[PDB]
């Protein structure tokens, strides 16, 4: 699990400066390394990614 970071990009044109227009960008990275459990009949490893 992780909480997304934030970066703010602000407009510079006249309309953006007066009104104060800005954007929020969110991104994250996740990775793991685990051993596979050996079984006589095998199995299926299903991965999920939920926001």
């Amino acid at each position: 699990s992780v909480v997304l970071g934030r970066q703010i990009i602000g407009a510079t044109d006249t309309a953006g400066v007066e009104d104060g227009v800005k954007r929020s960008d969110m991104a994250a990275q996740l990775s793991f390394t685990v051993p596979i459990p050996t079984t006589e009949l095998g199995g299926i490893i299903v991965t999920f990614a939920c926001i």
């Binding site: 400066v17 007066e18 009104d19 104060g20």
Partner: protein, 50 residues
């Protein structure tokens, strides 16, 4: 019976707008009889573009 045995906990986060020049209330924490402890409050400020 008026002695501390257990504890309470409150965590209120609020957002709003208040006009300048006005004594605007923001929060009201209740305190009952025979109670005490620590209170920590924080308020941010952000004005419209000038």
């Amino acid at each position: 019976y008026q002695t501390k045995r257990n504890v309470r906990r409150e965590a209120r986060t609020l957002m709003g707008r208040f006009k300048a020049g006005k004594l605007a209330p923001v929060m009201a924490v209740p305190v009952k009889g025979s109670e005490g402890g620590m209170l920590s409050q924080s308020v941010s400020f952000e004005l419209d573009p000038i």
